[PDB]
């Protein structure tokens, strides 16, 4: 018979099987659609989650309850040292999907790129990527022409420079990035011109843009139904425990209904956050990078004593609105939105008033080393 009272199910059914993600990297499932009209450009960028801060911003909205009154808002910081481009990929449309035609490589590549292809680079004689790097220019030309003739999609093979990060790992993270804008010939010229060079995040992305964020969530191990799926605990009375499962039910059908919530992995899931606004793009070159016009004292994004588990932010950085999936230290992939965004929030120009650099190692009672010296004065 029908239930006594009506409520939807706990949790989405659309993320079953709620298993471990296959691959660590935040792989882009689909690219934004190409536009022939637009000039050739990169569609994505990988960066490392460094930590969180809050930022103070001046607001719009005539007719709002809060209105123009400046607000304090949470934000995430994503370290973004330049990626290096190493390959060109040509893909062709078939009824059975996209198929690779060929891949063309740069003449010179990083050791860190090769280090990823070896498992045990330390004990290896390191033969991989040493012969074919030296392939004739005539061969490169023939392959590019072959790609021009038949392919309808061009992707560029880019990789991180891991040595710029403070992380223990030295194996580079390698990724394909589709090229959007122009036709294939213009794309090929753009990639060829770019080839051996390094790509700043500021090349791809401008301040005020809306961005899609691709990352694997924070791992917690294999968890019970309450933790995994949020079901109400059984009453205090219960013989075999309050966190004992949901009742599966049904004598006919004679099987468990898969839609039941059940024990297994919590976290380590692949996730796309969509439409996150860029509040600021910082630059390593700027000596006043986390400073503002309102507060002009010397600040870089790195907190007082550095970030917990991350310390100094080494290079250029993205200050992104709110929460980002996965842990600090994790690679995070930024992608352009699938369709351009015409919303108020998308259009809006951020004017920041303040960026905190107080300690998050402690209870952040102080802001800078100079300020701490001035405050205390005498010491042993």
């Amino acid at each position: 018979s029908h239930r006594k009272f009506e409520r939807p199910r706990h949790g989405s059914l659309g993320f079953l099987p709620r298993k471990r993600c296959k691959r660590l990297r935040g792989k882009i499932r689909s690219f934004p659609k190409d536009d022939k009209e637009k000039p050739p450009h990169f569609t994505a960028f990988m960066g490392y989650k460094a930590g969180m801060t809050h930022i103070v911003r001046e607001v719009d909205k005539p007719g709002s309850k809060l209105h123009k009154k400046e607000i304090v808002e949470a934000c995430t910081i994503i370290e973004c040292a330049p990626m290096v481009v190493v390959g060109i990929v040509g893909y062709r449309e078939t009824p059975k999907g996209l198929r690779i035609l060929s891949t063309v490589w740069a003449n010179h590549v990083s050791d860190e790129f090769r280090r990823r292809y070896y498992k045990n680079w330390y004990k290896s004689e390191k033969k991989a990527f040493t012969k074919s790097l030296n392939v004739p220019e005539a061969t490169k030309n023939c392959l590019l022409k072959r790609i021009e003739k038949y392919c309808t999609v061009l992707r560029a093979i880019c990789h991180t420079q891991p040595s710029k990060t403070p992380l223990r790992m030295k194996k580079a993270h390698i990724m394909e990035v589709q090229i959007n804008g122009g036709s294939m010939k213009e794309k090929l010229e753009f990639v060829k011109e770019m080839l051996e060079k390094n790509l700043p995040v500021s090349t791809v992305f401008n301040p005020n843009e809306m961005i899609d964020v691709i990352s694997v969530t924070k791992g917690h191990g294999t968890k019970g139904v309450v933790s995994r799926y949020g079901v109400k605990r059984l009453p205090r009375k219960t013989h075999r425990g309050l966190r004992k499962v949901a009742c599966i039910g049904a004598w006919h059908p004679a099987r468990v209904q898969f839609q039941i919530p059940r024990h297994g992995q919590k976290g380590y899931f692949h996730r796309t956050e969509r439409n996150k606004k860029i509040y600021r793009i910082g630059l390593k070159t700027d000596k006043n990078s986390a400073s503002t016009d309102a507060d002009i004292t010397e600040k870089k994004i790195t907190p007082m004593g550095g970030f917990p588990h991350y310390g100094v932010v080494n290079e250029d950085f993205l200050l992104l609105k709110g929460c980002v999936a996965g842990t600090k230290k994790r690679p995070i992939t930024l992608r352009k939105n699938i369709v351009p965004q015409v919303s108020r929030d998308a259009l809006a120009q951020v004017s920041l008033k303040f960026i905190d650099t107080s300690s998050k190692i402690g209870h952040g009672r102080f802001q800078t080393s100079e300020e701490k010296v001035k405050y205390y004065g005498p010491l042993k």
């Binding site: 009272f5 309850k65 809060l66």
Partner: protein, 132 residues
Amino acid sequence: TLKNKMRITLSLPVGALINCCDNSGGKNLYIIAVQGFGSCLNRLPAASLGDMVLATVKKGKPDLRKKVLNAIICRQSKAWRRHEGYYIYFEDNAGVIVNPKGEMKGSAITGPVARECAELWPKLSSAASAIV
């Protein structure tokens, strides 16, 4: 009047006993229901500053007692985040009885009254000793 309120923290489940804070002759207010509340098996209805409750009078003048009355929450103990950048809180919880279109039974709100509810309701701003 624009009825916008912004998100203020959850507080005060039904059955709660709060101060009446005015010369109405009610001394306390016992909240029995919330106006505009959602629907859900798991939930119990809870109040906040911007929200219209329904109450009964346990302590106060005899005409007020046992009768059901509308009220507006004016002071609350539970902290909320103001967008000036601090978590604000009172010591105590208090509301004032009204009619269902928001006209005061009382006439002078003895404590201070939060700004987000005061600027919401004119008839409270008028009567309020201080705006918080």
